[PDB]
Amino acid sequence: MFNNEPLEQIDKELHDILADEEKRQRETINLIASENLTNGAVRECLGNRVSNKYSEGYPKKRYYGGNDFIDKIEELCQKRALEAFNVSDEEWGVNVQPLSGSAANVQALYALVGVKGKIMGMHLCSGGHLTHGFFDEKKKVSITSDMFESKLYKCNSQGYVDLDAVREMALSFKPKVIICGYTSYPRDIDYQQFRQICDEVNAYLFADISHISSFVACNILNNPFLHADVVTTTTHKILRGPRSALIFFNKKRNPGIEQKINSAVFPSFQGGPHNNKIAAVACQLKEVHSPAFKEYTQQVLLNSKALAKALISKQIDLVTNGTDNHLIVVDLRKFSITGSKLQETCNAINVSLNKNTIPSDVDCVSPSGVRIGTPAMTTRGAKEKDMEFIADVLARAIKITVDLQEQYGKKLVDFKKGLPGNAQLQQLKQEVVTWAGALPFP
Amino acid sequence: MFNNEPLEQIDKELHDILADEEKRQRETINLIASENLTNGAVRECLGNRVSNKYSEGYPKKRYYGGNDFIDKIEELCQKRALEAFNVSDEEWGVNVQPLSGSAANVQALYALVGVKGKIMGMHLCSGGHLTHGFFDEKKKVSITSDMFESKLYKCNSQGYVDLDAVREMALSFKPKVIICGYTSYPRDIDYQQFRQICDEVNAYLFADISHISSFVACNILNNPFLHADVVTTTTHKILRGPRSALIFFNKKRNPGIEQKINSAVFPSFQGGPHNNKIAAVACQLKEVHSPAFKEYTQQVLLNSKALAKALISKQIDLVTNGTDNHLIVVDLRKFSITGSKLQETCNAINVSLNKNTIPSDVDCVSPSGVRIGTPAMTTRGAKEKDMEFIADVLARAIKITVDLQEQYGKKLVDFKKGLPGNAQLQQLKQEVVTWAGALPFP
Numbered sequence: 001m002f003n004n005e006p007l008e009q010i011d012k013e014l015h016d017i018l019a020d021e022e023k024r025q026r027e028t029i030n031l032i033a034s035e036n037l038t039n040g041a042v043r044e045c046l047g048n049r050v051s052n053k054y055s056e057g058y059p060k061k062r063y064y065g066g067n068d069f070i071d072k073i074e075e076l077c078q079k080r081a082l083e084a085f086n087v088s089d090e091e092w093g094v095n096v097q098p099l100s101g102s103a104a105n106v107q108a109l110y111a112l113v114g115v116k117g118k119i120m121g122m123h124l125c126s127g128g129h130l131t132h133g134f135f136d137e138k139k140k141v142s143i144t145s146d147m148f149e150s151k152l153y154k155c156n157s158q159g160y161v162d163l164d165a166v167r168e169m170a171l172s173f174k175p176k177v178i179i180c181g182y183t184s185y186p187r188d189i190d191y192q193q194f195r196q197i198c199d200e201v202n203a204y205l206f207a208d209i210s211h212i213s214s215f216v217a218c219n220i221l222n223n224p225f226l227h228a229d230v231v232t233t234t235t236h237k238i239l240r241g242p243r244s245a246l247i248f249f250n251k252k253r254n255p256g257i258e259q260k261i262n263s264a265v266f267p268s269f270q271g272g273p274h275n276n277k278i279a280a281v282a283c284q285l286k287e288v289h290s291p292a293f294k295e296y297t298q299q300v301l302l303n304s305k306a307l308a309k310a311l312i313s314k315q316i317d318l319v320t321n322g323t324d325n326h327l328i329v330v331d332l333r334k335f336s337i338t339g340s341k342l343q344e345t346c347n348a349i350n351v352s353l354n355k356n357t358i359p360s361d362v363d364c365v366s367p368s369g370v371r372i373g374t375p376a377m378t379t380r381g382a383k384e385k386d387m388e389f390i391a392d393v394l395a396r397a398i399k400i401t402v403d404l405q406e407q408y409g410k411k412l413v414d415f416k417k418g419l420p421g422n423a424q425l426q427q428l429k430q431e432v433v434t435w436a437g438a439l440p441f442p
Numbered sequence: 443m444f445n446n447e448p449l450e451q452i453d454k455e456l457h458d459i460l461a462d463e464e465k466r467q468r469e470t471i472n473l474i475a476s477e478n479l480t481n482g483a484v485r486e487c488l489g490n491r492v493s494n495k496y497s498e499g500y501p502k503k504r505y506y507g508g509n510d511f512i513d514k515i516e517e518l519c520q521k522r523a524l525e526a527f528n529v530s531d532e533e534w535g536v537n538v539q540p541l542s543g544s545a546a547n548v549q550a551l552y553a554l555v556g557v558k559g560k561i562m563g564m565h566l567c568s569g570g571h572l573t574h575g576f577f578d579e580k581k582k583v584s585i586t587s588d589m590f591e592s593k594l595y596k597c598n599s600q601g602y603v604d605l606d607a608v609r610e611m612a613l614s615f616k617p618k619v620i621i622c623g624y625t626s627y628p629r630d631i632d633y634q635q636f637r638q639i640c641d642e643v644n645a646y647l648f649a650d651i652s653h654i655s656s657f658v659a660c661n662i663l664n665n666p667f668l669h670a671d672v673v674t675t676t677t678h679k680i681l682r683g684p685r686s687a688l689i690f691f692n693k694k695r696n697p698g699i700e701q702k703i704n705s706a707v708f709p710s711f712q713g714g715p716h717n718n719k720i721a722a723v724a725c726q727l728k729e730v731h732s733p734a735f736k737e738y739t740q741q742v743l744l745n746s747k748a749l750a751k752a753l754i755s756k757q758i759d760l761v762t763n764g765t766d767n768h769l770i771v772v773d774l775r776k777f778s779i780t781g782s783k784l785q786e787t788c789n790a791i792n793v794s795l796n797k798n799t800i801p802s803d804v805d806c807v808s809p810s811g812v813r814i815g816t817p818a819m820t821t822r823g824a825k826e827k828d829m830e831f832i833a834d835v836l837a838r839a840i841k842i843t844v845d846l847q848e849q850y851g852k853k854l855v856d857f858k859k860g861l862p863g864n865a866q867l868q869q870l871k872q873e874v875v876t877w878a879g880a881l882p883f884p
């Protein structure tokens with residue numbers, strides 16, 4: 001007693017929008033640093049009947065029965081997880097149930113510090129994530145600043161984490177967790193120095209490596225597992241998995257942490273796990289361990305260097321004047337345009353990127369930068385030589401943005417009337433669609 | 443630069459376990475009251491590329507661009523949602539972003555009461571959910587008893603919500619939220635009398651209808667929307683959607699609530715929505731609005747009535763001696779066997795059900811009942827006449843459970859040893875597999 005008609009027939013209206021999304025993705029130069037494209041196998045797992053099953057609890061420790069095949073799936077996933085991040089089942093454990101990065105962080109921070117607990121994170125306007133304790137002058141914007149008591153550190157004038165400021169605050173404010181690992185940070189992290197600062201205050205060291213996860217697994221960037229108590233990562237960004245998250249925990253440094261983390265996830269915060277997610281992670285984490293994935297991650301960094309370089313050759317400024325990872329933050333000051341304006345211009349030419357603060361920005365009000373990243377385009381086949389064109393396109397978009405602003409004024413609503421039907425943007429869009437359209441597409 | 447070979451070739455090891463999960467599901471009599479089977483269209487949406495997309499914020503209020511198609515998807519889902527539950531765009535709003543039931547409840551409760559706010563829910567051992575404020579002597583098990591301050595009401599001696607006890611407690615405790623709508627409750631709910639209790643204290647009325655959602659939509663059971671400030675529901679149980687949830691909020695009774703709830707979800711708790719979930723939810727909600735779905739939901743209740751009646755005819759007791767809904771709680775005291783044992787016996791014969799408390803239990807390690815439900819089997823095509831067989835199988839399992847206990851003792855470790863290789867269970871299993879295996883299967 002059900003309807004087994006294909007999606008096309010049963011719900012034409014939805015299928016049509018979906019058919020469109022797919023075309024927008026196919027015909028876009030996607031530079032959203034946090035985005036990627038899943039392969040067909042990952043998507044088969046996501047659409048698998050394994051999500052019919054309720055599986056509250058942990059393997060061999062379920063509330064319901066008939067969970068043996070589910071238990072294998074979850075245990076496979078924990079195993080492939082620890083292997084990928086080059087850690088022994090004996091020193092580290094992982095929880096693979098968190099539905100997403102924000103959930104994982106909240107769950108893991110609660111596990112460590114409880115309600116009214118003290119945490120330190122990087123400010124959002126400086127490149128920290130919302131769940132690193134974000135609050136405003138007027139509001140406790142993230143639960144992490146409300147259920148916890150948080151203090152936020154900043155970057156210096158050159159766009160680097162000010163470790164000396166981290167220390168001043170940590171001794172003065174006395175957190176039980178210090179979070180490092182960022183949403184928008186173009187450079188590698190000195191985890192050793194974080195590990196040393198925590199020790200003077202007795203704090204835990206939390207590394208959120210969602211943006212650089214593949215670099216960590218592939219031994220291309222600094223290893224946080226060498227120093228940290230907890231490591232979290234989403235599975236969907238550079239890692240190229242489904243939308244999900246991982247919590248890693250150092251048993252050796254902390255006996256009692258395993259049950260603390262597993263209990264935080266369920267039953268404090270979550271109910272039934274989404275087993276299709278757990279399955280999709282398994283599928284991808286296997287791909288991750290292969291030398292082919294190491295190729296890809298290397299290719300990611302090469303494109304990112306070639307891109308930063310090409311932009312500089314076009315006299316465009318970058319925060320920290322470079323990148324060690326997959327992401328670049330462009331500084332727009334020398335052109336007197338905002339990131340929102342350029343975001344608007346890139347939107348019109350099928351170039352996806354986002355506005356972003358620079359140190360010299362007082363508030364999150366008027367971002368002076370844009371964040372671009374190379375994982376999505378690398379997946380689609382772009383090589384170092386293709387970074388020229390992309391840089392060429394962003395330079396052209398910046399120039400058009402500067403022209404439109406002189407014509408239509410400083411206010412965004414005013415600025416925005418220039419875009420529709422602009423001969424230059426339509427020519428540029430066409431160049432983009434034409435190049436993007438024919439790129440390999442999972 | 444990716445690997446696009448089918449799941450079978452790419453990760454055969456996973457494909458096997460998954461193929462096994464599928465066979466186990468097809469060959470099981472599934473009586474888990476919270477379980478169902480999604481159609482193929484819902485699973486095409488779960489594995490659609492729409493989840494490649496970052497979409498933080500709300501439609502026409504996104505942080506990133508390129509989100510016009512996503513916006514069309516999310517607005518369609520809010521629209522199909524409000525109508526399915528027969529409420530006006532103008533009086534009710536809905537948030538469709540919560541990743542799961544537990545997240546939805548925690549988010550919605552946060553929105554209404556804040557950190558350290560007072561809430562009232564049904565005890566777990568009585569039939570409330572974990573997120574309704576559950577705690578233990580010595581341990582705050584759910585975040586809902588830690589981030590909030592909670593008190594837990596119980597059912598009376600006959601298995602009914604003791605409304606008088608609710609009032610005595612509420613007036614003493616002075617909560618800002620009283621939650622009704624339960625995990626294991628075989629009877630309908632008097633929302634009007636709950637509305638009246640809240641009014642005497644000025645608390646909000648929270649209705650979690652995850653288990654009965656279709657009944658409410660189809661105008662078969664009482665309407666919580668008539669009386670409630672907030673209604674949550676999962677989309678995966680009787681509603682037959684993906685693993686997701688909805689928060690409903692009454693704007694007409696509460697100006698301001700719409701921002702309070704939307705902001706609770708993001709950016710307080712969540713980051714990027716899972717657009718594949720949202721797409722899948724939209725797809726199912728369309729189906730929910732057809733009269734074919736009203737028929738299915740009627741069939742659920744008919745089956746549940748027939749099953750209760752058949753069990754009664756076999757001299758098995760039911761908490762409240764019947765059901766108004768999709769689920770039955772069997773009281774096993776007259777056979778002196780625990781739910782744990784029967785669950786074990788049912789596991790051995792491919793009959794999925796779970797242990798459950800009865801009023802006369804006080805502790806939760808001793809449960810004297812089992813919960814069964816009819817949505818899954820109804821989906822698979824079983825009609826009233828089939829409920830006899832299902833009752834006959836359950837009676838036979840109870841019988842074998844009594845016999846194995848007299849042979850092996852009252853301790854579960856010992857009891858279990860009687861199960862493997864038992865001539866009667868293997869006989870019963872085959873009858874189950876042969877009937878189950880051949881039933882319609884989405």
Ligand SMILES: Cc1[nH]nc2c1[C@](c1cc(C#N)cc(-c3cccc(F)c3)c1)(C1CCC1)C(C#N)=C(N)O2
Nearest residue numbers: 124125127128129130183184355356357498505709
């Ligand atoms: C949208 C989002 N999610 N998590 C983020 C952000 C992100 C962000 C940018 C902007 C802007 N403009 C605004 C927000 C934001 C999101 C919610 C509430 C709020 F007050 C601000 C968040 C964007 C820009 C790059 C990522 C950010 C920053 N800066 C960081 N570090 O973290």
Ligand SMILES: Cc1[nH]nc2c1[C@](c1cc(C#N)cc(-c3cccc(F)c3)c1)(C1CCC1)C(C#N)=C(N)O2
Nearest residue numbers: 063267566569570571572625626796797798799809
């Ligand atoms: C697993 C789960 N999640 N939410 C629930 C339960 C459920 C439950 C049953 C049993 C039993 N026996 C034990 C638990 C449970 C789950 C987590 C922690 C805990 F202390 C207890 C939870 C289910 C299993 C049968 C009904 C329940 C009840 N009773 C209610 N009302 O709510």
Ligand SMILES: Cc1ncc(COP(=O)(O)O)c(CNCC(=O)O)c1O
Nearest residue numbers: 034100101102129182183210713714
């Ligand atoms: C460092 C970090 N941690 C956690 C998350 C949260 O993941 P979910 O959205 O899956 O909750 C993000 C998301 N960052 C979004 C972006 O950079 O575009 C992140 O950048």
Ligand SMILES: Cc1ncc(COP(=O)(O)O)c(CNCC(=O)O)c1O
Nearest residue numbers: 271272476542543544571624625652
């Ligand atoms: C009252 C109630 N609310 C919410 C949920 C579900 O939350 P998740 O989607 O996070 O699992 C349940 C599921 N209860 C599981 C069961 O009855 O079997 C529930 O019983």
Ligand SMILES: [Cl-]
Nearest residue numbers: 274277488719
């Ligand atoms: Cl999903």
